[model samples]
Target: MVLSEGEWQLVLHVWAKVEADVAGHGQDILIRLFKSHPETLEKFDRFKHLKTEAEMKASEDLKKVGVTALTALGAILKKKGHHEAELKPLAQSHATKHKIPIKYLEFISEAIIHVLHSRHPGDFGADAQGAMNKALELFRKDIAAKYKELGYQGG
Candidate 1:
């Protein structure tokens, strides 16, 4: 996850807002990033895009996990289990299916950081950048472990 030095503040503010459910102005962020970097959309499979109301209405929804399962999963992730761990395999599979580079995962990260910076210029800085990177690293590890526990061994 390479974050440009100028973009650090936006990243921190975004992590704070999104986690608190305080509205990181996420819908707006999504619109701008997608408009600027449309290729990132290929990374969405069943998990990412389904978070939105519009995506749900369009018949694509969050992963098939039900409300209870999702709640449980959230609890697990929050507890610092392998939350973001699942992303790598999930993305790798998507790449195999769509014939895109797995490296686009980095692009997704770029788009996310870019969006956050665009929103909170005041909040950007070295501390926030390091915090988000460390925090997200922990989150990703939990997610990866989660998929393994769920019997999702990849081919």
Candidate 2:
């Protein structure tokens, strides 16, 4: 879905909040994901045993990776096609080195969208969700294609 300039601006407005508090916000997102979907914890060797949200929130790895992942997502949303050079390597690494299944990538988008709506109820309505859904789904699809090309089976 093609986003209009207003949609883009809304994205920037919402993401400005994300950028402002990466550590706090990112950890919240990840914690929500892990708590809401415990199966996801299996992907993180360090996090698999974390039983509570408080523990997950306190984890340095979760904080670091969450901030990094959210920031990369922000860059992808803002620059769109221009940042593929950066995204490609990360996609390859996620598929190959990290062994992340394609489903988790998709899950990340949905989880972030859920967080966005919760965090910014005033701005993250239907329009913002639609725009983000398109942008994030595109990103997921591209990365999953990279995963496929690398012969990573689990989706």
Candidate 3:
């Protein structure tokens, strides 16, 4: 899951385009996740009530969650290879407090890629997409490791 220096540049380049709109893009990611995997909504009490894209778009609660998620993602992206430690507490919270399944991470990653591509089709080329995919894969691996340490048995 190692990203080359060039790959990191590709990722960051496209990331910079959306970094300023984390709140909006994060909401889109989660909205895409819920649309693609409605079951995921069950994991979020604050967001489960959002039954439509419009409802989701208008949700203040969802916006808060989106901000939190995207802000963490921003930190991780900025840290690059040195980001593993940051995921530990996040993994712990998701495992113990939120009871999030490890599988949801994959869904979120896909949603993020989808949003990036849709938003910046010109900049998010295949190489950049691949780079982002690899980066998120690394992110997932670190979180999974923490989940394993916490004895989370669910997906």
Best by the TM-score measure: 3
RMSD of each: 8.3, 1.9, 1.4
* lDDT of each residue in 76-133, candidate 3, tens digit only: 9877768867888898899999888878889889899999999999999899999999
CA displacement after TM-score superposition, residue 97 of candidate 1 (Å) = 14
Lowest summed lDDT across 10 adjacent residues in model 2 is found at 79-88
lDDT of 1 by residue, 1-155 (tens): 33443333444344555445322334433444456667655444553544444654343132222222223323433433333444555434443454434244344445545655665656655566555555445544444444455444322
- Of the candidates numbered 1 and 3, which has the greater TM-score value? 3
* lDDT of model 1, residue 138: 52
Q: Write the per-residue lDDT of candidate 2 for residues 40-143, one digit (tens) a residue.
A: 77878877766788887888888998888877778877875455676788877887777877778777777788888888888788887887776777777777
Candidate 2 Cα deviation (angstroms), residue 14: 1.0
The superposed Cα distance between candidate 1 and the true structure at residue 51, in angstroms, equals: 19
Candidate 3 accuracy as TM-score = 0.94
Better of 2 and 3 by TM-score: 3
lDDT (Cα, 0-100) at 9 in candidate 3: 91
Q: Is candidate 1 or candidate 2 better by TM-score?
A: 2
TM per candidate comes to 0.43, 0.88, 0.94
